[PDB]
Design a protein around this ligand. Structure first.
Ligand SMILES: CC(=O)N[C@@H](Cc1cc(F)cc(F)c1)[C@H](O)CNC1(c2cc(CC(C)(C)C)cs2)CC1
Length: 372
């Protein structure tokens, strides 16, 4: 649901995906990063070395001040600014205009990125995690309350098939995937929180208490680049990934996500890097499904062929970031408290292996896999 939004995303590797928006009357055009890992809609509203444009409130006939300040601290970066409401629309989007909350960003630190082409962020997760508090209605919530747009969006993030993709607001576009959608419950409405019931690398169960995979949570987050795994899980995965690829040897800064590794163009040894299967809780009792990630997703290319290890240690739970979401079509079915995965039409290539969404699997005591 529908052709107008196909290919409405762009970006640079490791700097997120953005969609074109306009705010104010007359309309001012900004590129906005699409972030299911937070819930604030915020935009450059003042000069910055890295911004090529920004939101000019005084130039907008429709702007209203909320006379209240705001700040948001992300994993690394943070911004603060001023709350208002203005009229907002997505040009390659549904055909509508909403009055939404906007944080006019006045100061920032390590937020905007030099390469960038985006001037703001669209937090698509739920009011619970919004700043300054849950009474600040998120953008998707206002678009739903104010229009007829169904309460569902879908993200097809593609990986260089200078990245691109689609954000279908309001529905599912059957032209963007193959095979069956498989759905996992949204465990609680705050982040897009899910439960991982099993983990296998090259078909070997990690054999951990399934609570460790969700410790203290597992989320789907398009605003975080890497797959981020709890310490105990990170250690076990890097252990098997090391051993699968031991034929060759790598700097330590490589496994820590720091320094790139290189091979002669067209000779990257993909076969020595294992596939990772994440099993998600399903819709029916004792039933789950798996997504399989290929090394082409977790060895993210940096500009010979050169890559960073795109899995990292977490102390805040599992993060399924952009590299996991790439080559899947991921449906955020808020209306039904579920997230659907299918093989995307921009799926990642290997000459001998494929990324897959497969089910059904039987898995006992999936309830026990949730932390607390
Ligand atoms: C890398 C990163 O941090 N990405 C930002 C998006 C981003 C992209 C970018 F290019 C630059 C940034 F500074 C931020 C994304 O929201 C991360 N989502 C999560 C967190 C959100 C928050 C804020 C709350 C929800 C507590 C208010 C803290 S961790 C769950 C992990």
């Amino acid at each position: 649901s529908f052709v107008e939004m196909v290919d409405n995303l762009r970006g640079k590797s490791g700097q997120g995906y953005y969609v074109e928006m306009t705010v104010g009357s007359p309309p001012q055009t900004l590129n906005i990063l699409v972030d299911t890992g937070s819930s604030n809609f915020a935009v450059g509203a003042a000069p910055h070395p890295f911004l090529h444009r920004y939101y000019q409130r005084q130039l907008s006939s429709t702007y209203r001040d909320l006379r209240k300040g705001v700040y948001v601290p992300y994993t690394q970066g943070k911004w603060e600014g001023e709350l208002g409401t203005d009229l907002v629309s997505i040009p390659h989007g549904p055909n509508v205009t909403v009055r939404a909350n906007i944080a006019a960003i006045t100061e920032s630190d390590k937020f905007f990125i030099n390469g960038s082409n985006w001037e703001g962020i669209l937090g698509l997760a739920y009011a619970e995690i919004a700043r300054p508090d849950d009474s600040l209605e998120p953008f998707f919530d206002s678009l739903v309350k104010q229009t007829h747009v169904p309460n569902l969006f879908s993200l097809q993030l593609c990986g260089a098939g200078s990245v691109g993709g689609s954000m279908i607001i309001g529905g599912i576009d059957h032209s963007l995937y193959t095979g069956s959608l498989w759905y996992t419950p949204i465990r609680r409405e705050w982040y897009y929180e899910v439960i991982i019931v099993r983990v296998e690398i090259n078909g070997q169960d990690l054999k951990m208490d399934c609570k460790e995979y969700n410790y203290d949570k597992s989320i789907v987050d398009s605003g975080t680049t890497n797959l981020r795994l709890p310490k105990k899980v990170f250690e076990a995965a890097v252990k098997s990934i090391k051993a699968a690829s031991s034929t060759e040897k790598f700097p330590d800064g490589f496994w820590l996500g720091e320094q790139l590794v290189c091979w002669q163009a067209g000779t990257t040894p993909w076969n020595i890097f294992p596939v990772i299967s994440l099993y998600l809780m399903g819709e029916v009792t004792n039933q789950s499904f798996r997504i399989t990630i290929l090394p082409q997703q977790y060895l993210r290319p940096v500009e010979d062929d050169c890559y960073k290890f795109a899995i990292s240690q977490s102390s805040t739970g599992t993060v399924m970031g952009a590299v996991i979401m790439e080559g899947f079509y991921v449906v955020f079915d808020r209306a039904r408290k579920r997230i659907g995965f299918a093989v995307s039409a921009c799926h990642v290539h290997d000459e001998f292996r494929t990324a897959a969404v497969e089910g059904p699997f039987v898995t006992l005591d999936m309830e026990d896999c949730g932390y607390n």
